[PDB]
Symmetry: C3
Subunit: 87 residues, 3 copies
């Protein structure tokens, strides 16, 4: 099992992405109890990074399934496929 | 063997966590030489995130051993278990 | 295959390091297209972190091959081997 961890803002919020059994899932902290996030994509490996637009977060998750990495983007309303490509 | 890397401030301070077998250890830089960190917990995989509130550093390390992830927290006065649970 | 992701700024800039087949390579975004970076070193595992000194980015990439981790540094004028050791 493999994880990635990010955080932002004043609280801060934290997100932890976990890859296990070719599934990546997301656990979330926003100042209170941890909960399960909306992120669900395939992969055996995961990295993530984020930045702020004021108080709004932008997240990029790099989900590797085998020999291919797909970027997934959170920009405030849902996860979308990003433009990232590898070599 | 696997690592996670974090940094903060302008110097900067850097921490590098290494999972080797089922042990995670920590190497530190605060502007002079690399030194040995106090973090020692179990895991075959590690991720980490950090932030400064003013001058106060806060670190969260996600230590995964098999299918279980434990959060360890540094907030200026020792490492303690965080509330994180996985799926 | 395994990745590490960093970002900085508000645009943002993003770098994704991919360890694939005992090599680590880099893909880059600074606001328009993804392009291939100059980073290329051995490794089966990778982590990275970065900071800004004024407007100048500094990156550290921790490349692990087997039981050895090597630090690679970007400070505005090529990648250089860093002083990091695990012990
Ligand atoms: C920042 C967002 O926070 C919650 O809405 C999660 O359900 C999303 O997946 C994302 O992490």
């Amino acid at each position: 099992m493999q994880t990635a961890a990010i955080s932002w803002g004043t609280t801060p919020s934290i997100r932890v992405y976990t890859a296990n059994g070719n599934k990546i899932t997301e656990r979330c902290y926003d100042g209170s109890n941890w909960y399960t996030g909306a992120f669900n994509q395939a992969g055996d490996n995961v990295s993530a990074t984020c930045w702020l637009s004021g108080s709004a977060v932008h997240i990029r998750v790099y989900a590797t399934s085998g020999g291919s990495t797909t970027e997934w983007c959170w920009d405030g309303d849902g996860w979308t496929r990003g433009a990232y490509t590898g070599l």
